[PDB]
Design an enzyme around this catalytic site. Structure first.
Site, PDB file in Angstrom:
ATOM      1  N   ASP A   8     149.271 115.462 -37.465  1.00 50.37           N
ATOM      2  CA  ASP A   8     150.070 114.216 -37.837  1.00 50.37           C
ATOM      3  C   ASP A   8     148.987 112.975 -36.960  1.00 50.37           C
ATOM      4  O   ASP A   8     148.525 113.068 -35.629  1.00 50.37           O
ATOM      5  CB  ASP A   8     151.129 113.493 -37.121  1.00 50.37           C
ATOM      6  CG  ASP A   8     151.805 112.065 -36.868  1.00 50.37           C
ATOM      7  OD1 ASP A   8     151.280 111.253 -37.571  1.00 50.37           O
ATOM      8  OD2 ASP A   8     152.172 112.048 -35.659  1.00 50.37           O
ATOM      9  N   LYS A  69     143.097 103.706 -37.867  1.00 58.97           N
ATOM     10  CA  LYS A  69     144.450 103.779 -39.318  1.00 58.97           C
ATOM     11  C   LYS A  69     144.886 102.316 -39.999  1.00 58.97           C
ATOM     12  O   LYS A  69     145.010 102.331 -40.619  1.00 58.97           O
ATOM     13  CB  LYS A  69     145.778 104.173 -38.417  1.00 58.97           C
ATOM     14  CG  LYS A  69     146.029 104.952 -39.625  1.00 58.97           C
ATOM     15  CD  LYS A  69     147.590 105.689 -38.983  1.00 58.97           C
ATOM     16  CE  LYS A  69     148.376 106.665 -40.092  1.00 58.97           C
ATOM     17  NZ  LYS A  69     149.449 107.125 -39.399  1.00 58.97           N
ATOM     18  N   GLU A 173     154.468 110.911 -44.724  1.00 57.74           N
ATOM     19  CA  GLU A 173     154.947 111.120 -43.308  1.00 57.74           C
ATOM     20  C   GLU A 173     156.639 111.373 -42.919  1.00 57.74           C
ATOM     21  O   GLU A 173     157.521 111.788 -41.953  1.00 57.74           O
ATOM     22  CB  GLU A 173     154.626 109.845 -42.280  1.00 57.74           C
ATOM     23  CG  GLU A 173     152.935 109.564 -41.635  1.00 57.74           C
ATOM     24  CD  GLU A 173     152.938 108.384 -40.897  1.00 57.74           C
ATOM     25  OE1 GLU A 173     153.025 108.081 -40.617  1.00 57.74           O
ATOM     26  OE2 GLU A 173     151.278 108.222 -41.421  1.00 57.74           O
ATOM     27  N   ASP A 197     161.200 105.270 -38.354  1.00 56.92           N
ATOM     28  CA  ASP A 197     160.150 105.586 -37.886  1.00 56.92           C
ATOM     29  C   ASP A 197     159.316 103.988 -36.838  1.00 56.92           C
ATOM     30  O   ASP A 197     158.885 103.596 -37.927  1.00 56.92           O
ATOM     31  CB  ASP A 197     159.440 105.858 -39.085  1.00 56.92           C
ATOM     32  CG  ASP A 197     158.063 106.517 -37.786  1.00 56.92           C
ATOM     33  OD1 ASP A 197     157.508 106.433 -36.698  1.00 56.92           O
ATOM     34  OD2 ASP A 197     156.369 106.965 -38.702  1.00 56.92           O
TER      35      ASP A 197
END
Ligand SMILES: Nc1ncnc2c1ncn2[C@@H]1O[C@H](COP(=O)(O)OP(=O)(O)NP(=O)(O)O)[C@@H](O)[C@H]1O
Ligand SMILES: [Mg+2]
Length: 382
Positions: A8, A69, A173, A197
């Site tokens: 991850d 990211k 994800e 999330d």
């Protein structure tokens, strides 16, 4: 030969897992943590990655890189990049259209493409797995947000290759989180799953439909700039006001005092998810004044009330876009370190009229957990 692993690669924290003997093992790092900061730092003598990197950011703000990211697979001209860079303490330059982070390493000025920074974090995860497994890790499944386009997915794959990892597959994800709980098993008929999330700096809500083992992202929503960091900041602002009250000194200007206070708040916040109050003990915060205090979970919830509550807006939208009603969603799985907050759990449950929440697997390890399982099947280990 060695086993394939699942990784991850998060915006704020990354995690590595490996499936072995029908069980998934989430690998802890050198400091004993099960997740490691997606931080890279450059100094006169070395390049620090992970905990070592984050553990010195207040001292080396311009040479400590994070949020790679948010850059990866994107262009400099991108409005996203333009906006984001207004808040980054490190340099980001344009290089023929591609954004590059500019740092000072060993006296020399050097720049890196976002995929190179992420490969550094990836290398750290790889060596973490290798140290545990006692063997070299080559194959890996890396996760990525559902909304990532081809460029972003490409750049993530690239980060893997330059890190010495043979990326077996790039999976979403939310899908990895569903697989962690085994919601991919064929049970006849469709199943709608909601992935909530709330991580360190991003909020993603995804409604997946799973029929015959095939996932279908029906809808997605959330906020790219809402996460645990925002909760910390509210505590910081709260304490800055208190210090000023008790000592009539404003520590805002002092970047070091503030960063040390933030580190203390983030830690008190975690304690609050399991205790009703936590103490803040900071020696010589400003000048020579020690700042010794504490917060209660009630005060904490109170400082973030509007933020916590607003979390339901993207949930409502996801439902309407997916054309479903609360009653039609079969499973709700919590992902992200911020979902450990009791108030967030209550709030979501109340919204879904008491429905049970899937949260037996640490939310911040859920994605890695699923990727590890997926890696194993793709490697014939399962
Ligand atoms: N016990 C806890 N209570 C509250 N927050 C926690 C707890 N444990 C970890 N966190 C927070 O969770 C965040 C880490 O989330 P995590 O999901 O690991 O990140 P991530 O995937 O990188 N997230 P994102 O930044 O959204 O991509 C930080 O804001 C931590 O403070
Ligand atoms: Mg995440």
């Amino acid at each position: 030969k060695g086993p394939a692993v699942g990784i991850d690669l998060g915006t704020t924290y990354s995690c590595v897992g490996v499936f072995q003997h029908g069980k998934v093992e989430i690998i802890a790092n050198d400091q004993g943590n099960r997740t490691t900061p997606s931080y890279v730092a450059f100094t006169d003598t070395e390049r620090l990655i992970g905990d070592a990197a984050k553990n010195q950011v207040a001292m080396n703000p311009t040479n400590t890189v994070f949020d790679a990211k948010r850059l990866i697979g994107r262009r400099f001209d991108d409005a996203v990049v333009q906006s984001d860079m207004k808040h980054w303490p490190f340099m980001v330059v344009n290089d023929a259209g591609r954004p590059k982070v500019q740092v000072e390493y060993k006296g020399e000025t050097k720049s890196f493409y976002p995929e190179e920074v992420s490969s550094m974090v990836l290398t750290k995860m790889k060596e973490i797995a290798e140290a545990y497994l006692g063997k070299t890790v080559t194959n890996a499944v890396v996760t990525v947000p559902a909304y990532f386009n081809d460029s972003q997915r490409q750049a993530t794959k690239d980060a893997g290759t330059i890190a010495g990892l043979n990326v077996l597959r790039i999976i979403n994800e939310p899908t990895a989180a569903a697989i962690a709980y085994g919601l991919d098993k064929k049970v006849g008929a469709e199943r709608n799953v909601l992935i909530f999330d709330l991580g360190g700096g991003t909020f993603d809500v995804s409604i997946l439909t799973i029929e015959d083992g095939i996932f279908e992202v029906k809808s997605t929503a959330g906020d790219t700039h809402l996460g645990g960091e925002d909760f910390d900041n509210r505590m910081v602002n709260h304490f800055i006001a208190e210090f000023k009250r008790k000592h009539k000194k404003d520590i805002s200007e002092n970047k070091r005092a503030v960063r040390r206070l933030r580190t203390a708040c983030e830690r008190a916040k975690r304690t609050l998810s399991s205790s009703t109050q936590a103490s803040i003990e900071i020696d010589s915060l400003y000048e020579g004044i020690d700042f010794y205090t504490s917060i209660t979970r009630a005060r904490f919830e109170e400082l973030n009330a509007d933020l916590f509550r607003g979390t339901l807006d993207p949930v409502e939208k996801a439902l309407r876009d997916a054309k479903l009603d609360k009653s039609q969603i079969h499973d709700i799985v919590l992902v992200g370190g911020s979902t450990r907050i009791p108030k967030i759990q209550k709030l979501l449950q109340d919204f879904f009229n008491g429905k049970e929440l899937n949260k037996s697997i640490n939310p911040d390890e859920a994605v890695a957990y699923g990727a590890a399982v997926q890696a194993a099947i793709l490697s014939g280990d399962k």
